[PDB]
């Protein structure tokens, strides 16, 4: 019983960091778009990597 219960906890743990990952990808969208906007085609290598 208890190990299935703990499998249920693992499910919540999985969702938990999914939320934050999605959030930082939104931030990366913002920043990458801004940097290309000023960039005239030049862009940040680091953010393209991180995305």
């Amino acid at each position: 019983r208890d190990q299935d219960k703990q499998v249920n906890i693992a499910i919540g743990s999985s969702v938990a960091q999914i939320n934050n990952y999605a959030k930082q990808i939104a931030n990366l969208n913002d920043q990458i778009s801004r940097m290309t906007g000023v960039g005239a085609g030049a862009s940040p290598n680091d953010l393209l990597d991180q995305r």
């Binding site: 940097m35 862009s43 940040p44």
Partner: protein, 101 residues
């Protein structure tokens, strides 16, 4: 720019820090309670010059703990039983030894 030296110093510092971390995995090794600690690396912040791949170097983004809860907490109860039922058997052995023959 002072970039030329700064790239090198950034990488040098990051390497030394990661060295400390992996050491910390070694220095403890045997002692119970510890868990392996792993390290993060990433590009340096964007003083991007005028754009493009002017990345300026690297840094270590902290250290991670290889840690768990849903088997970690589950461990306490098993240890509880280990003590308790073992003791029930062990005390009876305290007595049967005297009175068996």
């Amino acid at each position: 720019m002072s970039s030329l030296i700064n790239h090198a110093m950034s990488g040098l510092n990051a390497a030394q820090a990661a060295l400390n971390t992996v050491s910390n995995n070694i220095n403890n090794y045997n002692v119970a309670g510890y868990t392996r600690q792993t390290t993060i690396l990433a590009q340096a912040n964007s003083t991007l010059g005028a754009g493009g791949w002017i990345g300026n170097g690297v840094y270590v983004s902290g250290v991670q703990r290889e840690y768990d809860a849903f088997i970690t907490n589950q461990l306490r109860g098993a240890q509880n039983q280990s003590s308790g039922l073992t003791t029930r058997y062990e005390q009876m052995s305290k007595i049967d030894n005297l009175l068996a023959d």
